């Protein structure tokens, strides 16, 4: 801990795009539950938000050249 | 009086009845100025000048 | 014609029309008229009861009498439910008897999704149409298509298109454009680049 | 005439009924053939939700990204 591995990712995002917020950040700490993977690839077929699709998938599709 | 004030000599009617003319509104001067969007407007012009689908969204 | 959007099913129909004009490969189709039907045009102006029915019926009778008309219905999935009402009959149920007896020769054009959701649900309408899969052309095929279309786009944009430009367009659109299909995205890349260089000067 | 249709996601299903034809199906031939110059405005979510379901209509429009 304290050693700057996240800061390295922010520095790379800044160098490649000009701002840290251009990085697509997905904190794995909210994916502890098995069904939390729905936030990445969307709701399972037949569920409520199935047609919305995954959040990470849409963010990557919008910006195909990014840091994840 | 109306006739004296009027014109003694008295092409898309449907669209005029339905839509608003942004060009005459810009001529009037009620649209706010747009600042610093040269690249996006240029891209819109480029898409509008295409032969095949020229519909920018 | 079944294929993903942008492959060229409408281009297939127009190529059939051009082949008819120049020289049709068989005799039986030497003198034929290919007419494109739009369901919006048919439904329009039928505010009174049954006018859609009489209009489509007259169309079918004229097809039967003429005998040299091949009807091309683009967006075939729109045929179901068209002109319907609380107790009226859609265009599909009108066309089914004529297709079954054999007075109509239709050329449909729809993607796999719309065909499967709309046409496959009805067995009577499905048993009269034969799917013709239109596949995405290869890279060399797309280059040939772009070279064939080069004249029209050069005329429109008043620029010169080089072969290296065609190769780059097809390769880059294949590698970096994922949501669309080869001919459409290559054509779009060529068209946008031409418009850009024309606007710059 | 250049046509501007703000809230382009309303194009799909507009005027649909039990036996009517909606605006998108009517306008598809004109949009494909370069006959009508239509400028559309919509949000990313509305684009994805409404005018990406109709893949043919999505094909007929060229998205221009307006960044913050
Ligand atoms: N062999 C070809 N020659 C010329 N143009 C083609 C060819 N194949 C495809 N195209 C282009 O692809 C487009 C046809 O797309 P299409 O699949 O008909 O769209 P939709 O599925 O929405 O009807 C046309 O604009 C045409 O310019
Ligand atoms: Mg960390
Ligand atoms: Mg078509």
Swiss-Prot record, chain A:
Transmembrane segments: none annotated. Induction: By heat shock. Transcriptionally regulated by CtsR. Up-regulated by heavy metals such as Cu(2+) and Cd(2+), but Zn(2+) and Co(2+) have no effect. Forms part of an operon with ctsR, mcsA and mcsB. Coiled coil: none annotated. ATP binds at residues 1-6. Signal peptide: none annotated. Required for growth at high temperatures, probably by acting as a chaperone during heat shock and targeting heat-denatured proteins for degradation by ClpP. Required for biofilm formation. May act as a chaperone regulating CtsR activity. May interact with ClpP. This is ATP-dependent Clp protease ATP-binding subunit ClpC. It comes from Staphylococcus aureus (strain NCTC 8325 / PS 47). The chain holds residues 547 to 614 of 818 of the full protein.
